[PDB]
Design a protein around this ligand. Structure first.
Ligand SMILES: O=C(O)Cc1cc(O)ccc1O
Ligand SMILES: O=C(O)Cc1cc(O)ccc1O
Ligand SMILES: O=C(O)Cc1cc(O)ccc1O
Ligand SMILES: O=C(O)Cc1cc(O)ccc1O
Ligand SMILES: [Fe+3]
Ligand SMILES: [Fe+3]
Ligand SMILES: [Fe+3]
Ligand SMILES: [Fe+3]
Lengths: 426, 425, 425, 425
């Protein structure tokens, strides 16, 4: 049923009725089908064209037709930041709550660059839901990157419907209205809420003009509108708060649209993974799928990086990640299988945080196997881990620090590292 | 009053002949026994196009002052309002009965940050009923002033300028000035720019002429005062008023040269660019002045106007399109009526449409425009404007409790009908 | 003929279902037994916004060809003309009698450099009376086509597009095509771009919409030929036509994806921006496409048009102002009449005003515009354009020797009167 | 021989203790009575990342020389060849019988410009059968040397380095050196860079390690000659050899410090990056050194290698894709065989595929690569490379008439079969 349009960054055009898009202009005095033209400006008007995101919508009712928004009683993001804590942290998977919880009600704040009330940089959540949304929602605080881990989602957006399963990702532009339906009854996955410059493909450098995530594989849904008359709740997230009003129509009433500010999805199984074909262990920036820049050239707001099935051929090399201390902040999760660097304790749905200059690296067991291994071409398979790497430090929420799922002795995973130093034998 | 023209020029003005040193900035014995002082409006190391600095030749160094002390009267110390995503509209602000000079009468409307940590832009509406009997400088930012009622006579260190409704003036951060109310009372708007100084927009395809022409930006000529007697010196620092008493007038600059200057501009001289075919151009096209960030293309704020202009778009919906925006749109009105809003938006009024809030023409403007007979139409007798900021503008507590805040703004859109017919393109 | 819309898109098109490999570019065994081939329009390492590259899935690789040999017929061999700083105007070019297909009919008009050392821009007028019975590619640059008389049907590697006067078309460097004349004969203008590929201008204050809207740029859908038999393949290299003989059609691309594409654009769809107040905006404001240099702001060439448009400027001299320009202004005319010239400038004609040559409205146009009663006037039924280049344009020997070159173009300004009266402001 | 390590370092080396002035560059009385001399490899005002300058402390200043005089023997005086778009391949070059030292033996293969107006890049193959009994510098550009047969002992102003096949060496413009042939004869390739100095490529997502690691670039330590006796000093200027005679050694630098240095690099140390999944990455991914232009992303030339490497791409056509390129591809071979060409391409040989020429794997390689059953495979015992330039490479007349030019290179692609079946995905 669902068709998609391909090509990251494209000026797309889609209409659900023939000729619904005005021809040769954006704002006819009398629009086709008696629709209303509406502009969704995702960026300042004066961005360089390469950075412009904006979409013209031709819709049954203007978005401006809504009564006063009011603050909902139920607020999942109102918990305070946790205390200062430099420790290396790891969480076991999050259980799905018993009480009714839809997609937006189910975000568990893990760690963020700032407090919810003054969004900046990145905010990280784990979502757990057991109901489809019976309302429509937009996020005024940022762009959303969704990384499903358990259960498929059907995401009905203003520009059309997309379905996403684990091993795929989805991105929803700031301000865009959507409704998240659960195809498998319940769902769990990771969210990076990006409050800065929109995610986009990394500069490829010497990799050139193809590879990593190829832009042909980024898919955007085709136009689709609803005509359901009767009360519909519109919720927006603003400064961390859920506010709502009630409409008497469906706000997913866009019959046609054209432009570049679009929801999209991507299948990580399609990543054109580049790595070493010789020796050593490349910097994990080499696995970058999407990135959000800052005004500081080369220092991202965040990089979305993956660790996929891949060939390991490095000769005479310590193949797992090197022991590491980073200016950046490293938040990892796991979609399936096991991650190469950690023998036990890092499960799908789990998470780790190694903040600025925290000493990390492969655990004792992994290290021991790696040095002893007899090296031949080896394909890592049946796994997908990822990282949200942020320039700003990630402060864990109080909820996360108080989480029963917060493992108590993560530090022990390094505790048995032996000295093997012998100044007498090079 | 005489003026020097040319936005961004290296000016030179002297109130006494030869008062400027010739061929250097720092003579050992300066003409007329004046003191050389440097006002660095930017870091020393800015590229030359970004540099703002003025050399002052003055009777007493600004360094001659006793300790500043916090004033009890603090117009800008009120809290920030609570979180509120709603579309907001305010009726004109009445002028207070209590004695209130220019600096005492800034009503905080909305700001990117709390007054104690200035960042981005702070927006105010000023109301005053007294001329200033003292001198003031703002350590927190550059001031953009947009008079709505009443003329201002502004005595600055670099000289005197007068501004009336339909003109704007800008006072650089740290520059001392004193505001006289020529008409007894005054009301207008203020954008306080805590970021990169306002400048002319990059014209892109518009090229090398158009919009605000640089020849129209006017700076006053040198004028000094020789009052001996106690003068209060007030500064705004991190939101607070602090003061000391001097025994001389700090407006004692006999000559100056450089680029860091106060200036004025008559909005009636704007070379308005628009469509000459069809459709409705983005309102960035009406940009008068802009403050950039380190992110190319994304301003700290754009100052944009909606002036008398020709509407000629054919087969077009001529009023603004329905819109949702990353940026934050604060609109004011200097005179007349604005084309997007039939009623409720008056001179001295304000509207705030925050990031991604759904806005556009009201139901009435909509009906009329679709049924209108398209033909060249001169919009006249109006002047609206917008301060557009990239950071969200947080309404102050005062603005949210304001009797002038309209209770039923959302109702102006309430009667928009569905006209959809799936069976008729 | 179907098209794909959106300037600069990563497009994907297949003439057979699933002819595009899914999830990769280079399968070991490609669908349908096709061959993968990459056309790199730019260096691999360009920033993504500047990247132009298309993947092709074709019956035979382009590498399957015998040695190229120089043809005896060389339309572009003529030398550069002598040095001449004068203002030049040519009448329309007659179509020659002898058989002349599209590539045989380019009359070199003016160019930044000799044809054997391509640089900047080379300008031609094409005259043809035969469809091509061969396939062609230009190794020297991107081709901007501006038809003036006659429809073209252009069969490219990526598919077929048809172009008529008032439309333009661009064929990327190195891409193979064949031109069929739908009307028996054809005439038009060519800008051959040896520099950075043409693209949409930065809009500055115009914002995110306007001028040439990206949705209006159309790219053909995949289309392949299967005619076996002998086919001549010609390439232009350093000004010369070289050819080889193939035993298959080189237009055998069954599927493709990417961003290095031919496209067309309808100039009637141009969202024309201009003055809605007074004065006369810089003609850069009419920019459709632009080729930049490494010097920001200074294009290799701007392609600018002068379309139907409302003139409403008040108390203004509305025709172009008198002008001297660093840049070099080559004008053509697709239909109608141009606003700055009253006689002598006809469809298919050309004018050249080089670096610092004094140009402006002719005496007749000037006289009328000063005397006119001013009111809203719609310029209609006309399309002029300009190729504006930063490097000087050297007229060819053929152009300087042309019978179509007018002998007394200077005379059109000869009657400009003084009207200066120092006693009457 | 000892070396200092780290591409782009501020190095410091002295052959006598304390010969480098401490804490300054220009003492009034320098240690040991030496002369200070600055070698400015770049403009003074380059950003520091781009700066190359070396301070020398030497026995006599370089200014002590008689007038230079044009040599009668001119190795590079032959003209450019005619225009020729064809794909070209040459067999290895024989070494001439006549006495020919390093600089006498450069055979021009292809260049962006005629020797008299150096621009971009010039490519040569050197053949020599004598060591130099004289000293040489190149005013026209930086030299990248790629030995293929025979070892070199290169005495430079900054010290002595030894280079063998599989290593490269770079000598900065203007620096003096003398080449000794350790094996009696030598043959190899040269890229003469007339533009921005070669440097490490921006790594992009590869990040902060990989490709050529900076620690592996080695520079010789100070070494001076005290001999008095006749020495000929030759320079290449605008393509011509000019010489004067000294009665002392110009390799008399006792101490030096700075960043403008000769260096060498072992290609066997290249941290090769490639696909660990599928497809065939752009060969830019093999970049060792690059020379930029003012156009970001578009190199003057990239130096790229094809080294021993693991081939794991699954369900993939593993050899280079068929290709047409804006850029110009000159390939060479140091040892073994290159993956894309079954026969005809030997160590010492060369290919040129110019802008938009159709290239790709030969029919033999292609056929085999489609049929092979894929498994992990280490390509080994090979080293090829490419000089890829943005400007077109014109082959010299010498190279076009060279007996070693292969008469039927096009034949290698002539047996490419159609395998298209439109009725079978
Ligand atoms: O495994 C980790 O925790 C992250 C990581 C991955 C990698 O490839 C190199 C370094 C590193 O810290
Ligand atoms: O009228 C408004 O509120 C502001 C506005 C002006 C305009 O020209 C286009 C869009 C827009 O929201
Ligand atoms: O008429 C011309 O020749 C071209 C031209 C057009 C314009 O709008 C302003 C100046 C100019 O030279
Ligand atoms: O083999 C060649 O001629 C050079 C080459 C190498 C490569 O990896 C991809 C394309 C290409 O043309
Ligand atoms: Fe790390
Ligand atoms: Fe708006
Ligand atoms: Fe002109
Ligand atoms: Fe190639």
């Amino acid at each position: 049923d669902l068709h998609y349009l391909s090509g990251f960054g494209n000026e797309f055009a889609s209409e659900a009725l023939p000729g619904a898009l005005p021809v040769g202009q954006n704002s006819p005095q009398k629009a086709p089908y008696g629709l209303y033209a509406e502009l969704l400006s995702g960026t300042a008007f004066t961005m360089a064209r390469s950075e412009l995101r904006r979409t013209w919508l031709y819709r049954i009712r203007p978005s401006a037709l809504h009564p006063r928004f009011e603050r909902l009683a139920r607020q999942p993001l109102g918990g305070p930041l946790g205390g200062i804590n430099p420790n290396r942290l790891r969480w076991s998977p999050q259980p799905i709550p018993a009480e009714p919880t839809d997609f937006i009600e189910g975000w568990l704040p893990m760690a963020a660059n700032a407090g919810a009330e003054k969004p900046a940089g990145v905010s990280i959540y784990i979502y757990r839901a057991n109901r489809s949304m019976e309302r429509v929602f937009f996020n005024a605080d940022g762009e959303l990157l969704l990384v499903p881990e358990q259960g498929r989602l059907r995401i009905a957006t203003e520009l059309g419907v997309m379905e996403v399963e684990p091993l795929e990702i989805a991105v929803i532009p700031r301000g865009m209205k959507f409704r998240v339906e659960l195809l498998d009854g319940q769902a769990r996955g990771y969210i990076a809420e990006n409050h800065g410059a929109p995610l986009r493909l990394p500069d490829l450098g010497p990799i050139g003009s193809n590879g990593l995530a190829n832009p042909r594989d980024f898919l955007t849904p085709v136009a689709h509108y609803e005509e359901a008359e009767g009360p519909v709740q519109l919720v927006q997230k603003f400064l961390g708060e859920h506010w709502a009003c009630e409409l008497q129509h469906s706000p997913l009433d866009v019959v046609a649209w054209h432009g570049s500010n679009v929801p999209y999805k991507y299948d990580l199984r399609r990543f054109n993974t580049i790595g070493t074909v010789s020796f050593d262990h490349p910097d994990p920036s080499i696995f970058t799928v999407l990135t959000s820049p800052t005004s500081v050239h080369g220092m991202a707001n965040m990089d979305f990086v993956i660790f996929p099935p891949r060939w390991m051929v490095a000769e005479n090399t310590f193949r797992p990640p090197w022991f590491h201390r980073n200016l950046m902040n490293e938040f990892m999760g796991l979609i399936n299988g096991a991650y190469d660097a950690k023998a036990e304790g890092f499960l799908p749905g789990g998470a780790s945080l190694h903040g600025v200059m925290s000493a990390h690296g492969p655990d004792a067991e992994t290290c021991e196997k790696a040095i002893a291994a007899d090296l031949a071409p080896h394909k890592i398979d049946n796994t997908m881990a990822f990282m949200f790497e942020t320039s700003q430090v990630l402060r864990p929420s109080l909820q996360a620090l108080e989480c029963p799922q917060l493992q108590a002795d993560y530090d022990s995973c390094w505790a048995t590292l032996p000295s093997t130093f012998n100044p007498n034998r090079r």
